[PDB]
């Protein structure tokens, strides 16, 4: 349903963008 | 707040970014840069 | 007649280019 | 009504903790370990 | 290392801070013939012992102010005060007096550094030494 | 008799002994705080500190905030507390990044880059926990 | 640190040395004046630029000049 249709994309995207945000700092 | 101009949703997100997100990010980066020791 | 929202979005997309050019110029001037 | 309140509460619990979970996952030695990606020190 | 016998003082809040044990501190030692009262440059008055005394301060100016007070504000004057710089690693550098003779009087063995051989009115013009990273006095 | 003397036996330091600077009750109460306790991991220190500091922040917006009149009152307080704790964690992380980026020691595990980062993460999660438990206590029904 | 320079107009009057509170100046032997002594600044790294030495100088304009430059912990007179 619409609930899954939105959450299946939303719930990993925030995780991934937080990951990339941290990688933007982990670089020496 | 809302208006009758086209794309009325643009201020809703643009103004908070230019008011909170952008200043927070630039002050954070500037604070990090001005404090990096060495390489004078 | 008033502008269309597509015009506003296109204006933002166009304004993306001077932002990138300004970033490049500032980084060049930093050297 | 109360439904919007619960919607806001549910969307406030999860988003920050998810972002911070991602930040913690890649900040510690977990991203390299799980995915097999080598850390820059080991490179030869 | 150094001597001891600190002056009898009740302490104050105007003394040392973190820098003392992180960057440097200063020590001043002197021998007094009587157990008397002097004025601490950090606020308040303290009793200095009869014999040798050692005092730790945070700035060289404070040590030299106490030295001035010792030299001038006592009828039996004090001329043997010594000022050292105490590094956080325990290394102690003897600062004042440099050669043991007071700087106010001429003495042999000095190098005469910092002296220009010209008048202050004969300094080079700023424009002529442009793009040299030096001001007119530096040349 | 004299309740005021030198600070920890050295008068020449810039401090004085007071019934609140080195009293037994003062040292006992301070030494047992989460930021100063013994044998506590930095992550758990941060969790404990953040729990309280986010619990108490729920107050002012609920009673004085712009939404205090409406039913969206405790929610407004919760949102304000969450935003404040988020900005607090960002500031903590920035301080940790800029402070201990030089030489690293393990004499104090809080005063090191990894220790401070763990402190910040635990502080974040504790802030969320405390703010949410405060909201659950204050907010009526909604269950 | 600040730079303290002594020019050839000094008369060996020693006022500058006594006026200095941080022990930067010194009296050295010389021949260009009647007093046969001149001022030197061996410890300029301890000078705070308080300009007391210049205020004590009696010669026309100043035989001793102080130019303020890079500020360190010593030259800023910090106790913390
Ligand atoms: C320098 C020119 C300028 C200025 C002062 C403003 C000012 C404003 N714009 Mg605007 N805008 C501009 C150019 C400008 N605009 C241009 C060229 C575009 C086309 C892309 C837009 C598109 C635009 C939209 C779509 C919206 C605004 C909005 C706003 C208002 C919200 C605050 C803001 O700027 O953030 C938002 C504005 C932006 C993110 C625009 C990007 C900045 C432009 C493109 C370049 C500015 C560069 C500038 C020279 C940098 C100088 C640095 C200096 C301070 C040191 C504010 C009155 C909002 C509004 O009206 O709310 C009611 C809104 O929704 N602007
Ligand atoms: C830069 C632009 C900017 C923007 C867009 C806002 C926006 C806002 N401010 Mg504000 N503020 C700003 C700058 C800004 N501020 C500055 C520079 C100061 C310093 C003087 C303040 C000081 C200030 C105070 C003291 C307060 C606000 C509050 C608010 C909120 C009131 C709206 C409402 O109905 O509350 C309810 C709004 C919501 C429930 C939506 C929350 C949305 C996000 C998730 C909140 C984070 C609103 C989100 C009030 C507040 O905290 O309200 C919560 C409040 O008490 N502002
Ligand atoms: C004002 C200071 C203060 C505050 C706000 C807290 C707050 C808290 N402590 Mg705590 N604690 C304190 C001082 C404080 N502590 C001191 C001085 C000691 C040393 C004796 C402890 C020893 C201690 C232990 C051993 C435990 C807590 C726990 C807790 C949490 C559970 C809440 C609870 O039991 O009800 C309110 C209680 C208090 C306000 C106290 C809570 C966040 C528990 C915890 O972390 O739960 C997982 C737990 O097991 N505390
Ligand atoms: C809005 C401000 C505010 C408030 C209300 C609190 C509240 C709290 N903090 Mg907190 N904190 C704050 C800002 C604040 N914090 C800031 C800005 C920082 C950054 C440095 C911290 C860092 C911090 C740490 C690191 C810790 C706390 C802790 C605590 C809790 C225990 C109280 C405490 O620290 O002992 C009270 C405060 C002190 C003992 C500090 C000295 C305060 C002065 C000197 C008191 C003067 C004495 C005087 C004689 C008293 C009588 C005066 C008058 C009544 C006559 C409590 C929930 C502790 C905790 O986790 O608890 C669970 C803890 O370990 N805080
Ligand atoms: C602007 C300042 C301000 C404001 C408006 C509030 C407002 C509030 N606080 Mg509060 N608080 C503040 C500062 C503030 N706080 C500070 C500085 C501290 C110390 C760090 C606390 C510590 C604190 C605790 C420990 C508790 C509150 C609680 C509360 C709520 C209940 C009112 C009350 O006193 O309990 C009245 C009594 C009850 C509601 C009975 C509940 C049991 C209320 C929304 C309570 C809460 O949210 O739980 C319900 C609570 O337990 N506050
Ligand atoms: C000190 C001055 C002051 C005070 C007390 C207030 C008070 C208030 N303002 Mg306001 N404001 C001020 C100056 C002030 N304002 C200024 C200068 C501006 C800009 C010109 C604004 C702009 C502004 C806006 C735009 C809005 C407010 C709003 C509010 C209300 C709720 C939001 C709030 O502040 O709580 C939120 C909570 C905090 C800001 C943080 C709480 C800080 C805690 C309580 C400190 C406690 C310290 C602790 C006790 C130390 C002891 C610890 C010990 C026990 C261990 C509240 C009545 C909002 C409103 O409409 O409400 C009616 C709103 O929308 N203000
Ligand atoms: C365990 C995690 C989550 C749960 C259980 C959850 C639950 C829900 C529920 C019950 C709804 C229905 C309310 C509504 O549609 O108005 C909803 C809607 C929504 N959720 Fe989540 N949520 C979670 C996480 C997230 C996250 C992290 C995002 C990030 C963007 C997200 C995005 C959305 C969006 C955009 C909607 C609106 C749907 C619509 O308008 O059709 N969700 N969520
Ligand atoms: C008690 C204590 C200590 C002593 C503290 C004392 C005596 C006083 C402290 C007072 C303090 C820290 C007050 C703090 C006030 C904070 C305020 C007023 C914050 C306001 C925030 C607002 C209104 C935010 C608004 C917004 C948010 C949250 C956003 O994210 C963006 C939007 C917006 C701007 C609206 C010390 C000794 C410092 C440490 C010890 O551990 C604990
Ligand atoms: C992707 C995409 C979309 C959205 C696009 C969006 C959202 C675009 C946003 C654009 C923005 C936000 C543009 C911002 C522009 C900023 C500019 C042009 C800044 C210029 C600065 C200049 C010229 C000079 C600065 C300076 C110089 C030179 C220095 O040396 C130092 C001082 C300083 C002043 C800094 C949508 C979905 C619609 C459609 C699909 C494609
Ligand atoms: C980009 C752009 C631009 C620019 C902009 C800028 C540059 C901005 C800045 C920004 C900024 C500048 C920001 C700021 C912010 C801030 C904040 C956000 C703050 C907050 C605060 C608060 C929150 C407060 C609180 C308080 C206190 C502290 C005390 C008293 C009380 C009260 C509560 C009030 C322009 C215009 C050209 C336009 C185009 C684009
Ligand atoms: C521990 C703790 C805490 C604390 C925290 C912290 C410690 C914080 C910090 C914070 C910080 C530490 C922050 C910082 C900030 C910064 C800033 C805000 C900056 C700004 C900037 C600017 C202003 C800029 C300027 C400029 C420059 C510099 C150059 C160019 C130009 C310009 C102008 C741009 C809390 C309370 C939470 C709680 C409890 C625990
Ligand atoms: S005060 Fe002037 S004239 Fe006298 S000794 Fe010093 S530099 Fe020479
Ligand atoms: S400026 Fe002050 S500290 Fe420097 S030499 Fe002159 S009197 Fe001494």
Radius of gyration of chain F from its Cα atoms, rounded to whole angstroms = 20
DSSP element (H, E) containing G66: strand G64-67
State how far the Cα of F27 lies from the Cα of F21, in Å rounded to an integer. Answer: 8
Distance F120 CA to ligand 7 centre (A): 27
Cα–Cα nearest to G67, from E137, D7, E21: E137
D10 touches chain A (CB under 8 A): no
CB-based burial of residue G56 (10 Å sphere; 0-12 exposed, 13-18 middle, 19+ buried)? middle
Positive or negative CA dihedral for D23, D28, D33, D39? positive
Backbone angles phi, psi at E17, to 5 degrees: -125, -170
Give me the residue spans of the domains in chain G. 1-80
- Which atom belonging to ligand 13 lies closest to the Cα atom of G19? 7
Q: What is the maximal distance between C-alpha atoms in chain D?
A: 61
Residues 6+ apart with CB under 8 A from E34: E50, E76
Number of other CB atoms surrounding residue G28 within 10 Å: 23
Other beta carbons within 10 angstroms of residue E131's beta carbon come to: 5
Check A15 against D15: CB less than 8 A apart. no
What is the longest distance spanned by two Cα atoms in chain B?
A: 54
Q: What is the DSSP string of G10-45?
A: -----HHHHH-SS---EEEE-SSSTT-EEEE-TTGG
Distance CA D8, CA D20 (A): 19
Round to whole Å and give the CA distance between D29 and A26: 11
Ligand closest to CA B19: 2
With beta carbons less than 8 A apart as the criterion, state whether G63 and G9 touch: yes
- Residue D11 backbone dihedrals phi, psi, to 5 degrees: -80, -15
Task: Estimate the crossing angle of helix F113-138 against helix D2-27, to 10 degrees.
Answer: 170
The minimal CB distance from B37 to the residues F87, F94, F102 is found for F102
**What's the reported resolution, in angstroms, to a tenth?**
3.2
* Secondary structure in 3-state letters for chain B: CCCCCCCCHHHHHHHHHHHHHHHHHHHHHHHHHHHCCCCC
Give dist(CA E88, CA E26) in Å, integer: 11
CB F45 near ligand 4, within 6 Å: no
Q: Which of F66, F67, F88, F131 should be mutated for ligand 6, with most atoms under 8 A from CB? A: F66
- Residue G33 among known ligand-binding residues: no
Residue where the block lists tokens 């969307």: D11
**For a pocket test of ligand 9, which of C4, C6, C10, C12 has the largest count of ligand atoms closer than 8 A to its C-beta?**
C12
**Strands, E, within chain F: which ranges?**
5-6, 16-17
Backbone angles phi, psi at F59, to 5 degrees: -70, -65
Q: Which residue of E has its CA nearest to G3?
A: E114
**How is E54-85 classified by DSSP, letter by letter?**
EEEES-HHHHHHHHHHHHHS-SS-----EEEE
CA gap E64, E75 in Å, rounded: 19
- The answer for A 2-21 residues in CB contact with D (under 8 A) is 11, 14-19, 21
For the record, the structure tokens of F51 come out as: 């729990």
Contact A11, D15 (CB under 8 A): no
**Peptide bond preceding E97 in cis form (omega within 30 of 0):** yes
Cα dihedral across residues F82, F84, F86, F89: positive or negative: negative
Residue of B nearest to F97 (CA): B32
Mutate to test the interface with G, among E60, E107, E138 (most CBs of G within 10 A): E60
Residues of F with a Cβ under 8 Å from any B Cβ are: 87, 90, 94, 97-98, 101-102
Inter-chain Cβ pairs, chain E and chain G, closer than 8 A = 105
Q: Do F72 and D5 touch (CB under 8 A)?
A: yes
Neighbours of G66 (CB within 10 A): 22
Ligand 4: atom nearest CA of F29 is 39
- Beta carbons of F77 and F66 less than 8 angstroms apart: no
CA of G6 to the centre of ligand 12 (A): 8
Contact in structure between E138 and G3 (CB atoms under 8 Å) = yes
Query: Is the CB of residue G44 less than 8 Å from the CB of residue G3?
Result: yes
Tell which CATH classification among 3.30.1470.10, 3.90.1150.10, 3.40.50.300, 2.60.260.20 matches the domain E18-138.
3.30.1470.10
Query: CA Rg, chain G, in Å?
Result: 13
F39 beta partners: none
Q: How far away is chain F from the Cα of D23, in angstroms, using its nearest Cα? A: 9
Q: How far apart are the C-alpha atoms of F124 and F92, rounded to whole Å?
A: 10
DSSP string, E16-35: B-GGGGTT-EEEEEEEESS-
Cα–Cα distance for residue pair G46/G1, rounded to 1 Å: 8
Instruction: Collapse the DSSP code of E132 into the 3-class scheme (helix H, G, I; strand E, B; otherwise coil) and give the result.
Output: coil
Pocket of ligand 11 (CB under 6 A): B 27, 30-31, 34; F 49, 53, 88, 91-92, 94-95
Could you tell me the maximum CA-CA distance found in chain C, to the nearest angstrom? 48
Counting every residue, how long is chain G?
80
Domain D1-44: CATH class, spelled out: mainly alpha
Contact predicate E73/E52, CB 8 Å:
no
Q: Closest chain G residue to E110 measured between Cα atoms?
A: G28
Q: Is A9 exposed, middle or buried (0-12, 13-18, 19+ CB in 10 A)?
A: exposed
Q: How long a stretch of residues is chain B?
A: 40
Phi, psi for E21 (deg, rounded to 5): -100, 10
| Partner residue opposite D23 with nearest CB, options A11, A21, A28 | A21
Could you tell me if E93 and E85 are in contact, meaning their C-beta atoms sit under 8 angstroms apart? yes
Out of F71, F78, F86, name the one closest to residue D16 (CB).
Answer: F86
Domains (range + CATH), chain F: 5-138 (1.20.1240.10)
């Amino acid at each position: 349903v619409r609930w899954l249709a939105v959450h299946t994309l939303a719930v990993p995207s925030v995780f991934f963008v937080g990951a990339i945000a941290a990688m933007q700092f982990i670089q020496r | 707040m809302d208006g009758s101009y086209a794309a009325s949703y643009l201020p809703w997100i643009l103004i908070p970014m230019v008011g909170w997100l952008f200043p927070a990010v630039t002050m954070g980066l500037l604070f990090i840069h001005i404090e990096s020791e060495g390489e004078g | 007649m008033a502008l269309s929202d597509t015009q506003i979005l296109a204006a933002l997309v166009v304004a993306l280019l001077p932002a990138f050019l300004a970033f490049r110029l500032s980084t060049e001037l930093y050297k | 009504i109360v439904t919007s309140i619960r919607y806001w509460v549910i969307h406030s619990i999860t988003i920050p903790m998810l972002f911070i979970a991602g930040w913690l996952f890649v900040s510690t030695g977990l991203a390299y370990d799980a995915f097999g990606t080598p850390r820059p020190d080991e490179y030869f | 290392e150094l001597s001891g016998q600190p002056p009898k003082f009740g302490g104050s809040t105007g003394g040392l801070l973190s820098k003392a044990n992180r960057e440097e501190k200063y020590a001043i030692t002197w021998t007094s013939a009587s157990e008397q009262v002097f004025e601490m440059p950090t606020g308040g008055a303290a009793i200095m012992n009869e014999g040798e005394n050692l005092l730790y301060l945070a700035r060289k100016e404070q040590c030299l102010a106490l030295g001035t007070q010792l030299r001038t504000k006592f009828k039996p004057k004090i001329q043997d005060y010594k000022i050292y710089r105490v590094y956080p690693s325990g290394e102690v550098q003897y600062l004042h007096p440099a050669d043991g003779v007071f700087p106010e009087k001429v003495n042999e063995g000095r190098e005469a550094q910092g002296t220009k051989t010209r008048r202050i009115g004969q300094n080079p013009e700023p424009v002529t030494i442009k793009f040299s990273g030096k001001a007119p006095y530096e040349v | 008799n004299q309740v005021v003397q030198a600070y920890n036996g050295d008068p020449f330091v810039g401090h004085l002994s007071t019934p609140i600077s080195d009293s037994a009750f003062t040292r006992t109460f301070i030494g047992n705080l989460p930021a100063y306790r013994k044998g506590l991991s930095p992550i758990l220190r941060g969790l404990e500190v953040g729990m309280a500091h986010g619990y108490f922040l729920i107050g002012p917006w609920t009673l004085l905030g712009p939404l205090r009149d409406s039913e969206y009152q405790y929610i407004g307080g919760l949102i304000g507390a969450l935003a404040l704790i988020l900005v607090a964690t960002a500031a903590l992380s920035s301080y940790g990044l800029v402070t201990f980026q030089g030489e690293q020691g393990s004499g104090d595990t809080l005063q090191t880059a990894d220790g401070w980062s763990q402190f910040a993460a635990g502080f974040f999660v504790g802030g969320m926990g405390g703010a949410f438990v405060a909201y659950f206590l204050l907010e009526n029904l909604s269950v | 640190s600040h730079s303290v320079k002594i020019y050839d107009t000094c008369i060996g009057c020693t006022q500058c040395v006594r006026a200095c509170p941080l022990d930067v100046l010194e009296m050295v032997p010389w021949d260009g004046c009647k007093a046969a002594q001149i001022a030197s600044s061996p410890r300029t790294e301890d000078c705070v630029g308080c300009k007391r030495c210049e205020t004590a100088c009696p010669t026309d304009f100043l035989s001793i000049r102080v130019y303020l430059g890079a500020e360190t912990t010593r030259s800023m007179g910090l106790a913390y």
